Amino acid sequence: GYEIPARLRTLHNLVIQYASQGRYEVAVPLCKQALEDLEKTSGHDHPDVATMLNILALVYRDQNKYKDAAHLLNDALAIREKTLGKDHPAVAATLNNLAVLYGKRGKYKEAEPLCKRALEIREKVLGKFHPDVAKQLSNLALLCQNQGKAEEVEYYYRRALEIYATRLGPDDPNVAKTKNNLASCYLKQGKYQDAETLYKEILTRAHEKEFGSVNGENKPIWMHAEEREESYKACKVDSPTVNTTLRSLGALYRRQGKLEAAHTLEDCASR
Amino acid sequence: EIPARLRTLHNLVIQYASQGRYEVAVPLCKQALEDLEKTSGHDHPDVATMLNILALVYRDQNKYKDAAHLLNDALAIREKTLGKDHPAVAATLNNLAVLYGKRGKYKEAEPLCKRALEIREKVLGKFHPDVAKQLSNLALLCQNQGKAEEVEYYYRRALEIYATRLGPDDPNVAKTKNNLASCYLKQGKYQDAETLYKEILTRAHEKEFGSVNGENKPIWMHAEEREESKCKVDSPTVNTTLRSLGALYRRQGKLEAAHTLEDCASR
Amino acid sequence: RMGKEVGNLLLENSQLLETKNALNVVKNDLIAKVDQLSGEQEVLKGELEAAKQAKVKLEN
Amino acid sequence: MGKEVGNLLLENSQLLETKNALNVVKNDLIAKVDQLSGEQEVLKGELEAAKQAKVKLENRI
């Protein structure tokens, strides 16, 4: 919910343009004059002043004027809470922006409540099982991963996957991305079998999309290697996400002792 | 006449100065001048161009001393960079002369106008129609000074260009013959002005109703016949002529002639 | 000459301010002309790509 | 007087920074208007070239 109004569009791009060229001496004053032009007409407490302040704070983020950027975003959220009301998407967008600024400075705990309030705002407007609520749960999981809150990471990624897998298709990359992230969280907890099953699920859907339903012949890539451990190969290296899975599960078979299985999986990933 | 990169800013200045947004136009001009000296240096055709624009905005504001100074500086740059006897130099002299005349400095504006006419003649040719427009303007500067002889010479030269270079039906020709006749009336060259008026009326009549024959006599010739007692041309120049020749007939005692000519003009 | 210095600073501050406000006015007007043009170029890009497809539709 | 001078010097510098930023943007905006007006003149030519081609096709089919 970060819609930039028609008027500010050109000036906004010009700001971004100058702030990318590292022409801060031009960008900051353009922002500052635009703010005075906005209060002349609209008054401080306005959605456009809030928009214009958020832009400047991101220019102060680029400069590493982190205290200025934080203050500017607090003022912007304050305007957005009056004008647009609390529990507004613009209010959610600002809290996420403020949490991203805090995480950057390593203030992960400080960024945690902001992220939690925004997810609460997202759930109210979009619905509990909305795909954007899933993107928020994923972001809140990263926040906990950085704090080493292993259990919290698993809960958040588990909630996210619930939304992704049911609301979107199984073939969706967001689903595979979550299952790989959650499996990683499991590996940290020592929930090896849980992560292994997750990897297998990924590989099995990939295989099914390529070569229809799994029957007697046309067994998946993993199932071919696990059978190889007792003694041709058609495997598609379509996605980078599918390689991470192949490499991961391979290493996991090396831990199990199923070395030939780890090998063939490594080879398919190499191919 | 304006260089490529300056074109947009120049229009923007003219637009703001026309809207009467002087507070915008003057500073835009002033910043552009500093940006032009940064790169080019004061003595540059672009600084000269930019200064001429500003002094014309100062004319509109009635900052006449500022406008004069600015134009003097611009002509000074134009003499170095573009050289003396350059059209840009001529344009500036005309600008300074128009500014002087407005203030009533007619004598001061007279040499500037004379130098520009000299430039115009060199580049365009002695009998060019723009040389005629210049001679007319210079003739007007002498009229304001009351230099009757000078006015007659300049309007006589202008008419020579107009009448030969352009057609007889051209309005510029009739305009000059009316202005020159007026100058004659001031000198007391009544018969000369009278003949001039008659010439105007006679060409007008001929364009409308072919060549003058026995039956088809002009408007004046009909009134001169009326004085020995027994038209609706929507041209404003042709009315001035009719009224003016009537005024002459009124002075000549040929009142019926003055009357019919006044009436045709009224129609 | 503190008073002389103040007078000069006030003159320069006013000159600067006049220019800043003139530049702001022009910049705003220039943005609106860029917006009017970018919108107009979209109408034209749409019109040209509509007729480019109509070229093939007539030939068929 | 000294406190006043200091404040005027601060304000003059702030104003100058903004004036120069505004001048930079104004120049860039003029160049974008020039690039656009030129590009629209190109497109106006392309549209009137195809408008004539519309009639040329109809004369055949």
The DSSP-derived string for D1-61 is -HHHHHHHHHHHHHHHHHHHHHHHHHHHHHHHHHHHHHHHHHHHHHHHHHHHHHHHHHTT-
Best CA proximity match to A157, nearest among A177, A130, A128 = A177
Measured between beta carbons, the chain A residues lying within 8 angstroms of D30 are none
- Looking at CA atoms only, how far is residue A30 from chain D in angstroms? 7
Assigned token pair, B28: 């835009």
CB pair distance less than 8 Å for C26 and B28: yes
The neighbour count for residue B58, using CB atoms within 10 Å, is 24
What b/e sequence results for A28-54 when a residue is b if at least 16 CB atoms lie within 10 Å of its CB, and e otherwise? bbbbbbbbeebeeeeeeebbbbbbbbb
Contact between B241 and B176 (Cβ < 8 Å)? no
Three-state DSSP class for B9?
Answer: helix
Under 8 Å CB-to-CB from C53, ≥6 apart: which residues? none
Put simply, whether C51 touches B (Cβ < 8 Å) is no
Assigned token pair, B186: 């001031």
Q: Do chain A and chain B touch with ≥3 beta carbon pairs under 8 Å?
A: no
Question: According to the entry, how was the structure determined?
Answer: X-ray
Measured between beta carbons, the chain C residues lying within 8 angstroms of A11 are 31
CB pair distance less than 8 Å for A37 and C24: yes
DSSP-assigned states of every residue in B122-135: HHH-TT-HHHHHHH
Q: How many angstroms is the resolution? A: 3.2
Look at chain B and report how many structural domains it folds into: 1
Taking the CA of residue B105 as centre, how many other CA atoms within 13 Å lie in the half-sphere pointing to its CB? 14
Alpha-carbon gap, residue A83 to A76, rounded angstroms: 11
Put simply, whether D39 touches B (Cβ < 8 Å) is no
Under 8 Å CB-to-CB from A93, ≥6 apart: which residues? A1, A2, A118
- Which CA distances in Å does B249 have to B181, B204, B223, B239, B257? 14, 19, 10, 15, 6
Measured between beta carbons, the chain D residues lying within 8 angstroms of C54 are 54
Q: Which residues of B touch C (CB under 8 A)?
A: 12, 16, 21, 23-28, 30-31
Measured between beta carbons, the chain D residues lying within 8 angstroms of B12 are 30
CB pair distance less than 8 Å for D25 and A25: no
Contact between A99 and A119 (Cβ < 8 Å)? no
Chains in contact with D, where contact requires at least 3 CB pairs less than 8 Å apart:
A, B, C
Range of the domain at A29: 1-271
- Looking at CA atoms only, how far is residue A145 from chain D in angstroms? 43
Alpha-carbon gap, residue A112 to A108, rounded angstroms: 6
Measured between beta carbons, the chain C residues lying within 8 angstroms of B23 are 18, 21-22
Q: Which helix (H) or strand (E) holds A235?
A: none
Give the chain C residue nearest B21 (alpha carbons). C22
Assigned token pair, A68: 């200025």
Put simply, whether D36 touches B (Cβ < 8 Å) is no
Alpha-carbon gap, residue B4 to D30, rounded angstroms: 12
**Angle, helices A8-20/C2-59, rounded to nearest 10 degrees:** 110
What string of H, E and C letters represents the secondary structure of B201-264? HHHHHHHHHCCCCCCCCCHHHHHHHHCCCCCCCCCHHHHHHHHHHHHHHHHHCCHHHHHHHHHH
